[PDB]
């Protein structure tokens, strides 16, 4: 199960990032992300920004309702419980669920650019970057410690392979 993001910075195509989802370990979390990528439910990631990009840490996005971390929702209604914490944040290039504490998974996600073991048991890891990591790096280079970006970076288009 692979999905992708066509990323743009200020309307300029930067490249396509492809993720492999861990359907076998976290099927419910993977399905949520997959559906949001295709937009088949009537809402999703296309057009949503990477509102928080922090160099030496991670890229966060997925808030398609407010684009600032206060919005977003899962395909299950509101927020859903943490499926499990089997997968760990042992290296860069991992897809994990951003949240507001225990069992508050919605649509926001983050892509690690460094190992983040201290997040184990706190955030549900559900995928990895299999193509376009160089694009993740280009996006990271446009971030700042506060997470703010000078360019408007968005998931211009998304879908499943």
């Amino acid at each position: 199960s692979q999905v992708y993001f066509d990323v743009e910075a200020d309307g300029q195509p930067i490249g396509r990032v492809v993720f492999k989802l861990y359907n076998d370990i976290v099927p419910k979390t993977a399905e949520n992300f997959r559906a949001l990528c295709t937009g088949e439910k009537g809402f999703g990631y296309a057009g949503s920004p990477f509102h928080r990009v922090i160099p030496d840490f991670m890229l966060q996005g997925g808030d398609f309702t407010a684009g600032n971390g206060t919005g977003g929702k899962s395909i299950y209604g509101g927020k859903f419980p943490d499926e499990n914490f089997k997968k760990h944040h042992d290296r860069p290039g991992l897809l994990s669920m951003a949240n507001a504490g225990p069992n508050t998974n919605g649509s926001q996600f983050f892509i690690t650019t460094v190992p983040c073991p201290w997040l184990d048991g706190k955030h549900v890891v559900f995928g990895e970057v299999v193509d376009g990591y160089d694009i993740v790096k280009k996006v990271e280079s446009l971030g700042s410690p506060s997470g703010a970006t000078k360019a408007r970076i968005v998931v211009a288009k998304s879908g499943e392979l």
């Binding site: 840490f57 991670m58 971390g69 951003a98 507001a100 504490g101 983040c116």
Partner: peptide, 5 residues
């Protein structure tokens, strides 16, 4: 707002 960062 998590992960902090």
């Amino acid at each position: 707002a998590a992960p902090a960062x």
